[PDB]
């Protein structure tokens, strides 16, 4: 059908629409103007529109009539996400009103939010609505609805409007905002839920202590759509509910929402309902268009948010289970299933049963398939600190939950590991050669058939980018054409290759629903279509870069293919667990690690691979200052029955110890087996069970290897502390007292991180092969800690010992803690011993020692009938993984310079350096002290690292090289300034040895960029010795090595020159002006300074303006340095501080080429913008641009003279930008020099300077009209005044303000003497005038009148079309054309410009220009001047000069900081009187409403419906005529009572006389009186002129009873009837009742006067009848006309 077809196209729009960011505030700006209704229904109505959006409801002023004009525009200020305000409604409700009784609904439109953000704009234009009653929809129309609606985001503009005189103002199917096809159509979504399982615990549970703890919880289902919530039933002490209830939402089709938000609540008696989870289904992504519906399911939808342990205080993470935030923990998932069900619209019954036959249906979806699960812990690295003992937990879904004590040991979690110090700043956990391994078992719909596909799509995905990156880094590295060409081709036989996969066959596959069949012919459809464009591609084109943009389309195609709505798997939550809590988490899709039997591809990117992923705070969007863990992990996800298959994919040898514990005691000496009481002998690690050395047995798939040994050795075999080379040892030192009390050394004065006493530093010597750095111990600074680095904790019991620690101390503390490094260079009988039975064993014995134990271990190794898949099997056994050997590498780091870095000192600078970390090691470049823009040329190498696997999986995935920059501090603690990861090169042997490319990487802080980072990476598997290695680089400093040549950017000798031209705005430095300014511009190490200012004050530009150096530069315009600006104040005691720094990294546009019918003001206005035309008396016009002039394109910006950098100072908070303290206007060319002095210099580029000092200017503001400005009064209007600040002079117009408009028309000029450019910035700021409150402030502008000045497109004045020397077009410049000729031939370097023997032809440019070629075909009007201006004006407009304009300028401000408050069309003129005195001013004082009189006769009346009973009691009619123009209710007028009318006919002969204030140029009238009695100031409203003629029944001693009536809008008159009798209906238009024709219209202005008859109405059950005919004459007659033949 075409609604369906229609619909899936609507969705469609709104998928490809939604596509910005999702920021949870967003501020937007609706506005909603309602303009004119038309042929609204009843009958003598008073109508009103209210119009509703987000909860604020607008009104408009009781209008009258049944075609209503209202003009009124609403503003709605709202703040919240782009998408949920897309699905809001605007509800648009015509109203009529009573003068003794309420409202009563009449009409009502409703419309989505996002559709109008769809139309191109954001914002419909004057388009027609049809209003339609929601009760009385059977009747079809109620009215028509003419609304121009607009919506403003961050950075959006309106539109602007178009002329309406003929398009718009008429006919409305011309402007119908939705067709006639919909018919009002509903659409109903039939949201099937049927059950849903593992809803964690949301009740007290000690109501089922006094009387059962899996089921604490009572679900329900709320479902949001279209701003509607219905619930479904609440299932009483169940977490696996089953509901099985359709929720029948609907939406009428104009209106449509499309995020239906499920969300799960624990219902609550007593308190407020908890929340579960929130889910979505999107309707745009399980639709589209040949197309099909929104259909879904039935499939699960995985909720996820906070962690699911039940506290009864108000847990922290609640906003995750709201849907905010991504969730770190498995919170259920409900089974739900969506239909599209067309019209039908049942209101019965909006929570409906499940049908008997769906919960059959719903069976087949509802399989479980056995899921193994394996993850080995490669490396956790980049520990802050070692704390307690850290344990890594997996678990998808509720399978593998450490925390749900209620079920079997799991095993689904590592052994507690202690972090050991890598020697530099970080921690890692000690794995070596024995990797831990987690198995568990899951149960999850098999829904293969989905995953295969998504995989697949991935993978074509992620190859096609790959190659795409190759390609654009071949285009940027201008390399050859054939290789380009034969990499192009490559990419294309890939795309041949790749996209001919038939998609997996779902006949015969359980699961598959039918949006499962439409996706499949989705991406069938798809996927043919892009294989055969690809065919086409290969033989038809030629050139790659026409073809990348295609190329692009199809990368944004596939993987739109990889959107799975129907994602039913779970992810793989890995939790961190430090002590006994959950620290971190991070979430792995369950489809990336999958492995599928249909190949490599099918299966997911890691299955069987080992990641790196980076664990997260639960409640960070992005990794902050601290990473918790950098965790690589080798996650293989399968189904059991192809467990077998995982020995492909495992690596090393699998291995689980059984254990026994063997126990003895010490008396007199010696060791025996005496005294073992209460603790078993021969027992477990407890000693609590008695066990035997014959009790273990080898399950299946497993058997012994080797014998039984004793493990004493597990102390040693932890990796040695072999790997390292430069290290720094770490001793604690701890004190204690009672709380209160004074400080004295601990009873255990030095500990490590075991918990037990330490040996002292004196105590501590070097290992052989290694000798100390420094002499002695110090202590640290650079923690959280006091100025003597200590740390204060305190003990709570139960706990005897601290465990956390603050950076201040309080009274209650009782313990405190110290750390002390110096850098560092270049017994054992079996037993560990303790002081008491299964106590803290340790290695060596002491002094209070009197029990030891030993461990007895036997090996199990897998089984050859098995292979590594018998983990599996073990349905406690701890698996770790031992790999049988070792591979060296060697990583090389190039970290060369940064930019933009954050400001993190008071002195505006930083001190950045990094620490540069790769697995198990780190290292420290140097310290750059006082700058952002660090270059610390340095090569960070870590030789013989250790990385298990095979030397391919390095390969494939390179474990991340992470860098974090800081600010060093020398007190307090360094600041974090961001993070950069990126991957290194591998190399595994001497053919691929290429050399290392730097890159830009990204220097996340946050969530934005801070900077970028020029660093690259390449980590070399060493050989048989380090031969196979590259070279050491040169070194400048001991251990400190430089950036080497290859990988250096290759500098050449660079000219940068610095148009130092002034200094703007300089704020006060330490409560001082900025009195002796400088300029330091530093790029690449060498710095220029400019000559010191002596007063800023007097001049503000520096003396000698152009500044030079040479610099070192790369050849790459990838690599450019930033250029650095500070400014240094020179003040007394010979102190130079810097008061402002900018850095500026984009120098790509620096880089150039050294050796390349009354007239007047008004009048002109009103033909430029078109609203005896004014253009047919041979005038000129004006350029209206619709944005500022520096926005307009062509203008550059209006900084082509300089440009201007805003100038921060001091440290910057939240990761923005500093405080602006000034900006530093100028530009920079910069171009290569010659290598060597005997090729002479280019020449330089900073020539035709003007002259810098100040100069004092006459600037004549012009402001013409406000454009829907934003109000600011209780009655939604403003009265506008303008306040200009210009430097110190403030001229305000408070007393000569605007009432009440929200378009006001100033027409003001406001001349100034200011001087420039001491007083540059002109600030036109619009203000609310109120008569008793504060002024508010609709907006504010910023006019650089110094890039008017100097600019050399003449923005000081606009250049007009004609040169006129009289008259309203009086030149208002102060030179004359042939003087702004001769100073822009000047400028140009042309010669100066030649007029002839009699000013017909003026030599300029290289061209000659000649009178006839522009004079011909004008008119020569009077007020022309000289001929040779004109021909030299003519040259100028040619020239790309500034016209002549009116600039809309946008009005912002502090309410909302981006979004348009408003519009002011105004242009200023800047006049600098060294230059002469200007011309006169324009005169655009706005002109007065001409008045007018409407004059009426009322001949006759005929067949006017009688009355159907008087007072006297008869059939019988008081025919008599009201008469009315609409604005003007106090001039009704009435004719006198044709009494006695026994026919419908009645003769009155009666004279009307209607005064009204016209413009013919906006074709509309002006009526002006108060809103009310007590309003402050009279209004005026701009309606369109109409007559309003009415026929009534008198009733003389009764009231007055309507008949009919009859509107001729005096411009659009329709013709009349000559005779009564070929006078009849439906020559006037009609639009609800039948099928409608055009009407026959003339101007009554025009025309000046007819007569005849007309048909006059009213009507009922939505249909027209005729109440009768009247005759009439019309005439219009201006002021003297009226005096000439008055009338009465
Ligand atoms: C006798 C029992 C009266 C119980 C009266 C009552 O209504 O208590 C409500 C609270 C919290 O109960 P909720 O299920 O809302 O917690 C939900 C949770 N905040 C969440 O957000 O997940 O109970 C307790 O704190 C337990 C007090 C036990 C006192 C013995
Ligand atoms: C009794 C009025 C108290 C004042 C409150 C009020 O509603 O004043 C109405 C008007 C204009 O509105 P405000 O700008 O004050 O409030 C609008 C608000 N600032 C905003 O930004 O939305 O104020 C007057 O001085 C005229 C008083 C006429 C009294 C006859
Ligand atoms: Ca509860
Ligand atoms: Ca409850
Ligand atoms: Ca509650
Ligand atoms: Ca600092
Ligand atoms: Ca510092
Ligand atoms: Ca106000
Ligand atoms: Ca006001
Ligand atoms: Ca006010
Ligand atoms: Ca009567
Ligand atoms: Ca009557």
């Keep these: 059908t075409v609604s369906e077809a229609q619909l899936a196209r609507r969705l469609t729009k709104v998928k490809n629409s939604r596509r910005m960011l999702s920021n949870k505030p967003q501020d937007f700006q609706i506005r909603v103007r309602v303009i004119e209704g038309r042929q609204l229904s009843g009958n003598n109505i008073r109508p009103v529109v209210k119009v509703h959006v987000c909860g604020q409801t607008h009104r408009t002023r009781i209008k009258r009539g049944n075609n209503p004009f209202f003009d009124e525009l609403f503003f709605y200020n709202v703040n919240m996400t782009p998408s949920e305000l897309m699905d809001e409604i605007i509800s648009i409700r015509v109203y009529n009103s009573h003068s003794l009784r309420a409202d009563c609904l009449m009409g009502e439109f409703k419309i989505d939010v996002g559709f109008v953000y769809d139309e191109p704009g954001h914002a419909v234009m004057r388009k027609w609505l049809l209003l339609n009653d929601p009760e009385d929809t059977s009747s079809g129309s109620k009215g028509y609805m003419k609304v121009s609606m607009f919506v403003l985001g961050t950075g959006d503009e309106p539109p602007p409007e178009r002329r309406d005189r003929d398009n718009d103002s008429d006919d409305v199917e011309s402007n119908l905002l939705l067709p006639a096809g919909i018919a009002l159509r509903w659409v109903t979504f039939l949201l099937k839920i049927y059950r849903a399982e593992d809803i964690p615990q949301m009740d007290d549970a000690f109501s089922q202590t006094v009387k059962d703890k899996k089921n604490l919880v009572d679900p329900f289902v709320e479902v949001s759509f279209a701003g509607k919530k219905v619930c479904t039933n609440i299932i009483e002490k169940n977490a696996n509910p089953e509901w099985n209830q359709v929720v029948n939402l609907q939406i009428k089709f104009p209106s449509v929402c499309e995020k239906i938000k499920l969300t799960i609540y624990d219902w609550d008696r007593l308190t407020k309902n908890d929340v579960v989870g929130t889910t979505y289904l999107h309707l745009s992504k399980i639709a589209a268009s040949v197309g099909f519906v929104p259909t879904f399911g039935p499939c699960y939808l995985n909720l996820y948010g906070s962690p699911r342990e039940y506290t009864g205080f108000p847990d922290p993470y609640d906003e995750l289970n709201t849907g905010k935030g991504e969730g770190v923990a498995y919170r259920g998932r409900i089974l739900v299933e969506l239909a599209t069900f067309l019209e039908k619209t049942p209101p019965d019954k909006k929570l409906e049963p499940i049908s008997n036959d769906d919960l059959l249906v719903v069976e087949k979806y509802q399989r479980r398939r056995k899921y193994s699960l394996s993850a080995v812990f490669h490396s956790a690295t980049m520990l802050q600190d070692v704390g307690e003992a850290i344990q890594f937990e997996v678990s998808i879904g509720n399978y593998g939950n450490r925390f749900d004590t209620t079920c079997k040991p799991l095993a689904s979690t590592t052994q507690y590991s202690r972090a050991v110090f890598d020697g530099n700043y970080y921690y890692y956990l000690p794995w070596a050669h024995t990797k831990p391994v987690v198995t568990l078992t899951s149960y999850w719909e098999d829904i293969s058939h989905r995953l295969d596909a998504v995989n697949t799509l991935l993978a074509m995905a992620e190859r096609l980018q790959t190659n795409i990156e190759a390609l654009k880094s071949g285009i940027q590295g201008k390399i050859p054409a054939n290789q380009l060409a034969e990499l192009w081709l490559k990419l294309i036989d890939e795309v041949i290759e790749d996209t001919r996969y038939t998609l997996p066959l779902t006949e015969g596959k359980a699961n598959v629903t039918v949006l499962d069949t439409q996706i499949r012919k989705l991406r069938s459809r798809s996927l043919s279509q892009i294989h055969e464009a690809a065919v086409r591609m290969r033989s038809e084109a030629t050139d790659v870069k026409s073809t990348l943009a295609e190329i692009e389309d199809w990368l944004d195609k596939l993987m739109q293919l990889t959107e799975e709505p129907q994602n039913s798997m779970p992810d793989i939550i890995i939790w961190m667990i430090r002590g006994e809590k959950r620290l971190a988490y991070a979430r792995i899709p369950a489809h990336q690690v999958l492995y599928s039997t249909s190949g490599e591809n099918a299966s997911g990117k890691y299955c069987g691979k080992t990641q790196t992923i980076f664990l997260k705070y639960p409640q960070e969007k992005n990794n902050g200052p601290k990473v918790p863990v950098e965790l690589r992990v080798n996650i293989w996800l399968g189904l059991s029955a192809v467990e077998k298959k995982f020995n492909s994919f495992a690596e090393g040898t699998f291995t689980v110890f059984a254990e026994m514990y063997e126990n003895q005691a010490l008396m007199f000496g010696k060791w025996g087996t005496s005294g073992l009481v209460g603790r078993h002998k021969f027992s477990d690690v407890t000693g609590k069970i008695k066990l035997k050395r014959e009790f273990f047995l080898p399950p299946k798939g497993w058997e012994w290897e080797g014998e039984w040994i004793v ?978």
């Excluded at 420094?774 to 709570?796: C, F, L, P, Q």
């Excluded at 005169?1483 to 006297?1512: C, F, G, H, M």
Aim: charged share 30%; with cysteine; proline share 7%.
């Design 711 to 1688: 493990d004493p050795e597990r102390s040693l075999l932890t990796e040695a502390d072999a790997g390292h080379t430069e290290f720094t040892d770490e001793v604690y030192q701890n004190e204690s007292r009672y709380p209160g009390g004074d400080w004295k050394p601990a009873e255990d004065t030095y500990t490590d991180a075991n918990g037990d006493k330490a040996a002292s530093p004196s105590e501590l010597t070097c290992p052989p092969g290694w000798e100390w750095e420094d002499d002695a111990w110090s202590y640290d600074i650079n923690r959280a800690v006091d100025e003597k680095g200590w740390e204060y904790g305190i003990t709570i019991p139960p706990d005897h010992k601290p465990k956390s620690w603050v950076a201040a101390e309080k009274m209650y503390h009782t313990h405190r803690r110290r750390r002390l490094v110096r850098k560092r260079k270049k017994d054992q009988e079996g037993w560990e011993y303790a002081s008491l039975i299964g106590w803290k064993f340790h290695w060596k014995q002491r002094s209070s020692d009197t029990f030891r134990r030993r461990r007895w271990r036997r090996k199990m190794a897998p089984s050859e009938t098995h292979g590594a898949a018998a983990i599996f099997k073990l349905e406690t056994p701890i698996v770790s993984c031992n790999f049988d050997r070792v591979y060296i590498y060697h990583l090389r780091c190039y970290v060369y310079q940064a930019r933009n870095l954050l400001a993190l000192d008071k002195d505006s600078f930083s001190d950045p350096y990094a620490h540069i970390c790769f697995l198990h090691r780190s290292k420290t470049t140097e310290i750059i002290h006082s700058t952002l823009n660090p270059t610390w040329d340095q090569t960070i190498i870590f030789d013989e690292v250790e990385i298990y696997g095979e030397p391919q999986t390095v390969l494939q995935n390179p474990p991340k090289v992470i860098m974090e920059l800081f600010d060093n501090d020398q007190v307090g603690k360094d600041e974090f300034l961001g993070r950069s990861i990126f991957s290194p090169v591998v190399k595994l042997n001497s053919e691929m040895d290429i050399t290392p490319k730097l890159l830009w990487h990204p220097v996340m802080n946050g969530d934005k960029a801070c900077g970028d980072v020029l660093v690259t990476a390449e980590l070399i598997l060493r050989g048989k010795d380090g031969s196979n290695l590259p070279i050491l680089p040169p070194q400048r400093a001991p251990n400190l090595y430089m950036v080497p040549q290859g990988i250096r950017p290759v500098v050449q000798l660079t000219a940068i020159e610095i148009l130092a031209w002034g200094l703007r705005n300089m704020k006060n430095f330490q409560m001082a002006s900025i009195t002796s300014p400088s300029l330091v511009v530093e790029c690449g190490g060498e710095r220029v300074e400019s000559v010191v200012i002596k007063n800023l004050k007097k001049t503000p530009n520096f003396p000698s303006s152009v500044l030079f150096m040479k610099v070192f530069l790369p050849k790459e315009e990838l690599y450019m340095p930033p250029l650095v600006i500070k400014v240094i104040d020179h003040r007394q005691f010979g102190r130079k501080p810097v008061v402002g720094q900018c850095t500026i990294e984009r120098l790509d546009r620096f880089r150039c080429d050294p050796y390349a019918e009354i007239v007047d003001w008004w009048s002109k206005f009103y033909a430029s913008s078109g609203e005896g035309q004014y253009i047919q008396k041979g005038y000129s016009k004006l350029k209206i641009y619709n944005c500022e002039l520096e926005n307009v394109a062509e203008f550059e910006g209006l900084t082509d003279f300089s440009d201007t950098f805003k100038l921060y100072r001091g440290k910057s908070d939240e990761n923005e930008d500093p405080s602006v303290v000034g900006e530093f206007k100028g530009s920079f060319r910069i171009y290569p020099l010659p290598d060597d002095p005997s090729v002479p210099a280019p020449p330089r580029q900073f020539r035709e300077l003007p002259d810098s000092v100040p100069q004092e200017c006459t600037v004549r503001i012009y402001i013409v009209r406000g454009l829907e400005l934003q109000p600011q009064d209780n009655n939604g209007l403003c009265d506008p005044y303008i306040k200009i600040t210009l430097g110190k002079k403030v001229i305000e117009d408070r007393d000569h303000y605007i009432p009440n408009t929200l378009n006001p028309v100033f027409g003001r000029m406001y001349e100034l003497s200011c001087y420039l450019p001491q007083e540059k910035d002109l600030k036109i700021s619009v203000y609310d005038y109120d008569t008793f409150t504060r002024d508010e402030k609709v907006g504010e502008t910023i006019i650089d009148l110094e890039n008017r000045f100097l600019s050399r497109f003449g923005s000081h004045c606009g250049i007009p079309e004609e040169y006129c020397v009289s008259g309203v077009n009086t030149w208002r410049d102060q030179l004359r054309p042939t003087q702004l000729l001769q100073n822009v031939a000047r400028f140009k370097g042309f010669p100066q410009p030649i007029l002839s023997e009699d000013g017909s032809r003026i030599r300029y440019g290289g061209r000659d220009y000649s009178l006839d070629e522009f004079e011909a075909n004008k008119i020569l009007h009077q007020h022309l001047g000289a001929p040779e201006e004109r021909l030299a004006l003519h040259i100028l407009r040619t020239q790309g000069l500034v016209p002549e304009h009116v600039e809309t300028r946008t009005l912002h401000s502090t309410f909302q900081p981006n979004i348009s408050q408003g519009k002011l069309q105004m242009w200023v003129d800047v006049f600098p009187k060294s230059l002469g005195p200007p011309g006169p001013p324009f005169n655009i004082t706005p002109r007065k409403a001409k008045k007018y009189y409407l004059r009426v006769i009322i001949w006759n009346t005929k067949d006017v419906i009688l009355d159907e009973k008087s007072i006297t009691g008869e059939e019988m009619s008081d025919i008599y005529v009201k008469g009315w123009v609409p604005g003007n209710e106090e001039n009704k007028q009435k004719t006198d009572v044709h009494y006695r009318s026994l026919d419908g006919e009645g003769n009155f002969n009666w004279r009307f006389v209607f005064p009204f204030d016209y413009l013919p140029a906006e074709q509309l009238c002006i009526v002006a009186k108060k809103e009310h009695f007590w309003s402050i100031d009279q209004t005026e409203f701009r309606i369109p002129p109409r007559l309003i003629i009415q026929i009534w029944d008198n009733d003389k001693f009764s009231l007055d009873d309507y008949l009919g009536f009859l509107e001729l809008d005096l411009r659009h008159t329709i013709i009349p009837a000559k005779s009564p009798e070929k006078c009849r209906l439906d020559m006037i238009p009609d639009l609800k009742a039948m099928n409608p024709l055009k009407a026959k219209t003339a101007s009554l202005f025009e025309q000046k006067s007819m007569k005849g008859w007309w048909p006059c109405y009213a009507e009922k059950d939505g249909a027209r009848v005729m109440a009768g005919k009247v005759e009439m004459t019309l005439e219009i007659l201006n002021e003297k006309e009226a005096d000439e033949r008055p009338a009465g």
